[PDB]
């Protein structure tokens, strides 16, 4: 009687605190470790929410509760399909693991020498500003590592889950020997 | 017997789906509406997680479970105090409501004419790039609305929850009559 209550509450207390943690610190801009915990919680949350609605539809309070449970069941299923479609289509255009981050669907692809570095774009703009400070690149407010201003890519790819856009370098200014600025516009 | 199970499960099914929604779409870069739902969920999650641990400490499985519950109770309380301290200190330096967003603790303050517009900074850098395109301002990859390039602030404030930084305009270039670029560095 009381023992079953205690095991029930203890397990749920752990889960609710875990949801609070991933809801407060589960962001790649805060802690990459907590972000992966949130993603594992969200991956488990889709079928659990669906399966919980399947239960409330098999054992409902009334007919309206049975229908609502089925609507919520499809809702959990539709959100997972939607997430998988966007993340897959983004991953095929980028190959980066930021494609699976629901928080960001705009990705900036910049080729630095051999490989291409992908970073999430917060604001989808028609223009992106490149700033090389003494040999260190900063694209659209976020750093991209070391790169020579002369070896700046003439084209930069932005990847949304439904379209891949290319940005050609319109303007190019050099502040120093390796310091400079450049702009990119779509077409 | 079975009826209590049905009402209990139906309520939790709604809650778990709501957590899934706010965990998947609760971001200001996706939907401002879903973001506020997440914040209401998180504000309710702190005392609920604490109160649930208080229960498992009053009615524990064993002595170790009683101690763990008390540790989680203080953990839920410490995270809320931490969030409130950062958000308040940020709100006093900025006055913006983005200070209460746990996802962002770096805020960019740019004075556009009469008032000052604040936007969250993803990457805390020592430099911030200003780009005015035909009379539209873009600071660090995100737009700030209409502004004249001539009317660009000589100083821009960055506000972290523990320090307020000022950025003086080092370089200034004009691409056109109202189009131009500028950079800001801290001190
Ligand atoms: C930037 C650093 C700021 C300070 C960091 C503080 C670190 C957090 O401190 C928390 C320690 O406080 C102890 C809280 O006490 C826990 C209460 O537990 C009750 C035990 O119940 C068991 C009963 O059998
Ligand atoms: C930024 C760091 C700020 C640190 C602040 C930490 C504050 C933590 O508060 C600790 C208080 O929480 C302890 C909760 O324990 C109470 C449980 O009560 C159990 C009593 O059992 C009665 C038995 O009948």
Numbering used by the authors:
A (entry chain B), B (entry chain A): 13 to 199
Manuscript text:
The membrane (M) protein is the most abundant structural protein of coronaviruses including MERS-CoV, SARS-CoV, and SARS-CoV-2, and plays a central role in virus assembly through its interaction with various partner proteins. In coronaviruses, M protein is the only multispanning transmembrane structural protein and has been shown to interact with various partner proteins, including all viral structural proteins (S, M, E, and N) and some host factors involved in the interferon signaling pathway such as MAVS. Here, we present the first crystal structure of a betacoronavirus M protein from Pipistrellus bat coronavirus HKU5 (batCOV5-M), which is closely related to MERS-CoV, SARS-CoV, and SARS-CoV-2 M proteins. The batCOV5-M protein is closely related to MERS-M, and to a lesser extent, SARS-M and SARS2-M, sharing 95, 75 and 74% sequence homology, respectively.
After extensive crystallization trials and refinement, batCOV5-M crystallized in lipidic cubic phase (LCP) and the crystals diffracted to ∼3 Å resolution. The final batCOV5-M model was determined to 3.21 Å (batCOV5-Mxtal) and contained residues 13–199 of batCOV5-M, and the amino-terminus (12 residues) and the carboxy-terminus (21 residues) were not modeled due to weak electron densities. The batCOV5-Mxtal structure is organized as a homodimer, with each protomer containing a short amino-terminus, a three-helix transmembrane domain (TMD) and a cytosolic CTD consisting of an eight-stranded β-sandwich. The overall shape of the batCOV5-Mxtal dimer looks like a pair of pincers, with TMD as the “handle” and CTD as the “head” of the pincers. The two protomers form extensive TMD–TMD and CTD–CTD contacts with a buried area of ∼3,100 Å2 at the dimer interface, which accounts for ∼25% of the solvent-accessible surface area of each protomer, suggesting that the batCOV5-Mxtal dimer is a stable form. In the batCOV5-Mxtal structure, TM1 is placed almost in the sample plane as TM2/TM3, and the three helices of TMD resemble a capital letter “N,” while in SARS2-MAF the TMD helices form a more compact three-helix bundle. As a result, using TM2/TM3 as anchors, TM1 swings ∼40 degrees away from TM2 and CTD undergoes a rigid-body rotation of ∼30 degrees away from TMD during a transition from the “short” SARS2-MEM to the “long” batCOV5-Mxtal. Structural alignment yielded an all-Cα RMSD of 1.8 Å between batCOV5-Mxtal and SARS2-M-FabEM-long and an all-Cα RMSD of 1.6 Å between SARS2-MEM and SARS2-M-FabEM-short, while the major deviation came from flexible loops of these proteins. This result indicates that the structural organization is highly conserved in betacoronavirus M proteins, and the batCOV5-Mxtal structure represents the long conformation of M protein. In the second pattern, the N3C helix binds to a groove formed along the CTD dimer interface nearly vertical to the membrane plane.
